């Protein structure tokens with residue numbers, strides 16, 4: 001079935017006095033493809049997509065600061081912290097122009113960086129991405145009560161940090177097919193020390209839902225305005241029923257984003273990579289061949 005192994009040699013780079021881990025495969029010459037995961041995942045989420053792209057393009061997949069095999073300093077892990085570390089990661093590797101492949105909070109990082117560096121982004125492939133959720137009615141019903149509890153300090157931290165609910169419960173609820181024990185262990189590994197679960201709690205508290213927190217809402221609105229104006233080639237993957245991007249929203253985006261190709265992956269929730277990695281990787285690989293790179 002879907003591959004469970006992580007057959008990538010570790011690479012580390014110094015970023016702002018810490019070290020970040022990243023996958024780095026594929027040819028050295030050309031435009032690199034930068035894969036950005038979100039919550040509560042790591043570069044592991046790209047393990048079955050990267051092999052479709054690596055034959056033709058360099059694939060760089062960092063673990064966000066505090067996650068995967070990256071260092072876990074004593075930060076709050078605000079979106080601003082992820083921005084600072086990812087900006088510095090890209091510069092530390094000397095990347096010039098890139099293609100972005102982005103998901104969940106990795107998509108907020110990717111779109112925010114693209115808005116600020118438009119001349120350096122030659123294409124964006126994205127899925128289940130951060131957009132403003134104007135009211136809780138747009139969040140899926142079965143998951144509203146949980147995310148509302150996550151978005152508190154005392155109850156939410158007890159759930160996410162003390163009891164590891166984002167890993168043990170939410171993650172499994174983000175894939176239609178059942179994650180296997182080996183896959184769960186790969187997702188659990190970075191967070192075996194409860195103190196290291198800080199980013200898993202801060203992330204849902206940063207989600208731009210019903211206008212709060214206002215700083216995140218504004219930043220996400222700004223990159224969405226940029227995206228609808230930009231001629232950058234776009235590739236949107238979507239599934240049914242989705243979580244962040246239900247089918248009706250995917251359809252709205254497909255007709256209103258310039259130069260946008262849209263691919264229905266079939267059944268999918270949030271981690272679309274875990275329900276249909278082969279279609280995602282194969283379509284990205286072919287789409288890269290149509291770009292001016």
Ligand SMILES: [Cl-]
Nearest residue numbers: 039203204207
């Ligand atoms: Cl989240």
